[PDB]
Short mmCIF file of C-alpha atoms in Angstrom, two decimals:
data_model
loop_
_atom_site.label_atom_id
_atom_site.label_comp_id
_atom_site.label_asym_id
_atom_site.label_seq_id
_atom_site.Cartn_x
_atom_site.Cartn_y
_atom_site.Cartn_z
CA UNK Q 1 124.27 166.43 82.22
CA UNK Q 2 125.05 163.99 85.06
CA UNK Q 3 121.98 161.88 84.20
CA UNK Q 4 122.05 159.57 87.22
CA UNK Q 5 120.86 156.06 86.38
CA UNK Q 6 117.97 156.20 88.87
CA UNK Q 7 116.80 159.62 87.67
CA UNK Q 8 114.20 158.68 85.02
CA UNK Q 9 111.77 157.56 87.72
CA UNK Q 10 108.27 158.98 88.12
CA UNK Q 11 107.60 158.10 91.78
CA UNK Q 12 103.98 156.97 91.40
CA UNK Q 13 104.35 155.06 88.12
CA UNK Q 14 107.70 153.76 89.38
CA UNK Q 15 105.91 152.30 92.41
CA UNK Q 16 103.28 150.86 90.06
CA UNK Q 17 106.04 149.06 88.16
CA UNK Q 18 107.58 147.94 91.46
CA UNK Q 19 104.20 146.35 92.16
CA UNK Q 20 104.37 144.80 88.68
CA UNK Q 21 107.98 143.57 89.12
CA UNK Q 22 108.52 141.80 92.44
CA UNK Q 23 104.88 142.00 93.50
CA UNK Q 24 104.30 138.76 91.63
CA UNK Q 25 107.48 137.55 93.33
CA UNK Q 26 105.85 138.28 96.69
CA UNK Q 27 102.73 136.45 95.49
CA UNK Q 28 104.69 133.36 94.49
CA UNK Q 29 106.65 133.46 97.75
CA UNK Q 30 103.34 133.43 99.63
CA UNK Q 31 102.18 130.57 97.41
CA UNK Q 32 105.38 128.63 98.10
CA UNK Q 33 104.91 129.12 101.85
CA UNK Q 34 101.29 127.96 101.63
CA UNK Q 35 102.26 124.91 99.55
CA UNK Q 36 104.97 123.99 102.06
CA UNK Q 37 102.46 124.37 104.91
CA UNK Q 38 99.94 122.16 103.10
CA UNK Q 39 102.62 119.53 102.44
CA UNK Q 40 103.64 119.57 106.11
CA UNK Q 41 99.99 119.19 107.13
CA UNK Q 42 99.61 116.21 104.79
CA UNK Q 43 102.77 114.60 106.18
CA UNK Q 44 101.58 115.21 109.75
CA UNK Q 45 98.17 113.69 108.96
CA UNK Q 46 99.82 110.63 107.39
CA UNK Q 47 102.35 110.07 110.19
CA UNK Q 48 99.75 110.83 112.90
CA UNK Q 49 98.56 107.21 112.90
CA UNK K 1 91.93 77.99 107.40
CA UNK K 2 94.19 78.51 104.38
CA UNK K 3 91.72 76.45 102.34
CA UNK K 4 88.89 78.80 103.32
CA UNK K 5 91.08 81.83 102.60
CA UNK K 6 91.86 80.56 99.09
CA UNK K 7 88.18 79.75 98.53
CA UNK K 8 87.19 83.28 99.57
CA UNK K 9 89.87 84.82 97.35
CA UNK K 10 88.71 82.74 94.36
CA UNK K 11 84.97 83.28 94.87
CA UNK K 12 85.56 87.02 95.12
CA UNK K 13 86.51 88.31 91.69
CA UNK K 14 90.32 88.43 91.70
CA UNK K 15 92.45 88.27 88.57
CA UNK K 16 96.22 88.01 88.00
CA UNK K 17 98.02 90.49 85.75
CA UNK K 18 98.91 88.55 82.60
CA UNK K 19 101.73 89.69 80.31
CA UNK K 20 102.89 87.45 77.44
CA UNK K 21 101.37 84.47 79.25
CA UNK K 22 103.30 85.13 82.48
CA UNK K 23 101.78 85.96 85.86
CA UNK K 24 103.61 89.14 86.91
CA UNK K 25 101.32 90.09 89.80
CA UNK K 26 97.78 90.17 91.11
CA UNK K 27 94.99 92.73 91.38
CA UNK K 28 91.75 92.72 93.35
CA UNK K 29 88.65 94.83 93.97
CA UNK K 30 88.14 96.17 97.51
CA UNK K 31 85.44 98.61 98.56
CA UNK K 32 83.97 98.47 95.06
CA UNK K 33 86.92 99.95 93.14
CA UNK K 34 89.85 98.19 91.49
CA UNK K 35 93.43 98.72 92.67
CA UNK K 36 96.62 97.71 90.88
CA UNK K 37 100.32 97.98 91.80
CA UNK K 38 101.85 100.49 89.40
CA UNK K 39 105.23 98.75 89.16
CA UNK K 40 103.56 95.60 87.77
CA UNK K 41 103.05 95.82 84.00
CA UNK K 42 100.33 94.03 82.05
CA UNK K 43 96.55 93.85 81.96
CA UNK K 44 94.08 92.38 84.44
CA UNK K 45 92.78 88.91 83.58
CA UNK K 46 89.27 90.29 82.99
CA UNK K 47 88.18 92.00 79.77
CA UNK K 48 85.34 93.82 81.53
CA UNK K 49 87.64 95.12 84.27
CA UNK K 50 90.37 95.92 81.73
CA UNK K 51 87.92 98.37 80.14
CA UNK K 52 88.21 100.57 83.25
CA UNK K 53 90.62 103.50 83.03
CA UNK K 54 93.04 103.70 85.96
CA UNK K 55 94.58 106.71 87.70
CA UNK K 56 98.18 106.77 88.89
CA UNK K 57 99.58 107.47 92.38
CA UNK K 58 103.37 107.61 92.14
CA UNK K 59 103.88 108.14 95.88
CA UNK K 60 102.65 104.62 96.69
CA UNK K 61 103.30 103.04 93.26
CA UNK K 62 99.61 102.11 93.10
CA UNK K 63 96.76 102.64 90.65
CA UNK K 64 93.00 102.83 91.12
CA UNK K 65 89.88 102.89 88.95
CA UNK K 66 86.11 103.08 89.29
CA UNK K 67 84.16 99.81 89.18
CA UNK K 68 80.51 99.69 88.01
CA UNK K 69 78.03 99.44 90.88
CA UNK K 70 76.62 96.18 89.51
CA UNK K 71 80.17 94.82 89.76
CA UNK K 72 80.63 96.58 93.11
CA UNK K 73 78.03 94.07 94.33
CA UNK K 74 80.66 91.65 95.68
CA UNK K 75 84.06 93.08 96.62
CA UNK K 76 86.47 92.81 99.53
CA UNK K 77 85.32 94.01 102.94
CA UNK K 78 87.84 96.28 104.65
CA UNK K 79 88.18 96.81 108.40
CA UNK K 80 90.32 99.12 110.53
CA UNK K 81 90.55 96.82 113.59
CA UNK K 82 94.14 95.57 113.28
CA UNK K 83 95.23 94.11 116.63
CA UNK K 84 98.54 92.33 117.11
CA UNK K 85 98.57 88.63 116.38
CA UNK K 86 98.53 86.48 113.25
CA UNK K 87 96.57 86.88 110.01
CA UNK K 88 96.11 84.73 106.90
CA UNK K 89 96.90 85.29 103.23
CA UNK K 90 97.41 83.31 100.02
CA UNK K 91 100.81 81.85 100.99
CA UNK K 92 99.88 81.02 104.59
CA UNK K 93 100.04 83.07 107.78
CA UNK K 94 101.52 86.49 108.55
CA UNK K 95 102.75 87.82 111.89
CA UNK K 96 101.75 91.37 112.84
CA UNK K 97 103.93 92.99 115.50
CA UNK K 98 105.17 96.53 116.18
CA UNK K 99 102.94 97.72 113.34
CA UNK K 100 104.76 95.56 110.76
CA UNK K 101 103.82 92.36 108.93
CA UNK K 102 106.37 89.54 108.77
CA UNK K 103 106.25 86.03 107.30
CA UNK K 104 108.67 83.07 107.49
CA UNK K 105 111.54 83.03 105.01
CA UNK K 106 110.88 81.42 101.65
CA UNK K 107 107.30 82.74 101.55
CA UNK K 108 106.68 85.38 98.90
CA UNK K 109 108.66 86.36 95.81
CA UNK K 110 108.57 88.47 92.65
CA UNK K 111 105.07 88.26 91.19
CA UNK K 112 103.10 88.08 94.45
CA UNK K 113 102.40 91.83 94.59
CA UNK K 114 98.70 92.53 95.13
CA UNK K 115 97.83 89.69 97.51
CA UNK K 116 95.65 91.08 100.34
CA UNK K 117 95.90 90.15 104.01
CA UNK K 118 92.74 88.78 105.62
CA UNK K 119 91.64 88.62 109.25
CA UNK K 120 89.74 85.82 110.99
CA UNK K 121 86.48 87.26 109.59
CA UNK K 122 87.82 87.36 106.03
CA UNK K 123 88.16 91.15 106.02
CA UNK K 124 91.10 92.86 104.33
CA UNK K 125 93.56 94.59 106.64
CA UNK K 126 96.54 95.27 104.32
CA UNK K 127 97.85 94.81 100.78
CA UNK K 128 101.23 93.20 100.13
CA UNK K 129 103.40 95.12 97.66
CA UNK K 130 106.92 93.83 98.27
CA UNK K 131 109.36 92.47 100.79
CA UNK K 132 112.96 92.15 101.90
CA UNK K 133 115.05 89.25 103.15
CA UNK K 134 114.94 89.13 106.96
CA UNK K 135 116.98 86.05 107.83
CA UNK K 136 114.74 83.32 109.24
CA UNK K 137 111.72 85.39 108.13
CA UNK K 138 110.96 88.13 105.63
CA UNK K 139 109.27 91.48 106.24
CA UNK K 140 106.62 92.53 103.73
CA UNK K 141 106.12 96.12 102.60
CA UNK K 142 102.40 96.79 103.00
CA UNK K 143 99.87 99.62 103.08
CA UNK K 144 97.24 99.86 105.82
CA UNK K 145 94.48 102.33 106.64
CA UNK K 146 93.43 103.62 110.05
CA UNK K 147 89.90 104.35 111.24
CA UNK K 148 90.49 108.00 110.25
CA UNK K 149 91.07 107.05 106.61
CA UNK K 150 94.80 107.83 106.46
CA UNK K 151 96.85 105.83 103.95
CA UNK K 152 100.10 104.68 105.57
CA UNK K 153 102.78 102.76 103.66
CA UNK K 154 105.33 100.79 105.68
CA UNK K 155 108.50 100.23 103.64
CA UNK K 156 111.58 98.54 105.15
CA UNK K 157 114.90 100.18 104.33
CA UNK K 158 116.17 98.89 100.97
CA UNK K 159 113.00 96.87 100.42
CA UNK K 160 112.85 94.94 97.16
CA UNK K 161 109.85 95.04 94.82
CA UNK K 162 108.40 91.54 95.22
#
């Protein structure tokens, strides 16, 4: 009856939940990177002149 | 020259920002849409123009609004040709050098925000928003636009809202 903490996993569904938890984190990290890139482009366009 | 500049500013519809009977600034219409410095509180001295809803732009502390085409008939003419030299505005001349506008000391103070800068042809080249004491002269914080349409705000370090 060891019952290791990470033993109630179900491989496939566990990966599905991994995509549900942290996948949105990856999405918002990509969005943050894109927003930073857009801000840097705006600053470059403004300072260009 | 200054006489002609004042005549052109008066003939073109320009109206100070009145609050409790005090002139706290000025606003004008250029390119057929009204602009107003956000830091200045009050309403434009024109009931018809006051009816226009403005949008805010915190980055430059400026507001803008759409003007009816029939009132767009006669507005300021903007140009992008800004060579070095001297220009004219309400309180006299302004020196343009190194990309910055400077005027002699004692010219300009709190309440002058919104006065445009005109060239020899009467075209707007910049809008005065503030300034800072610069000894024998004072340097004005202005916004100017290049031929590519980029809004650039020049603000001296520790510039005061004039």
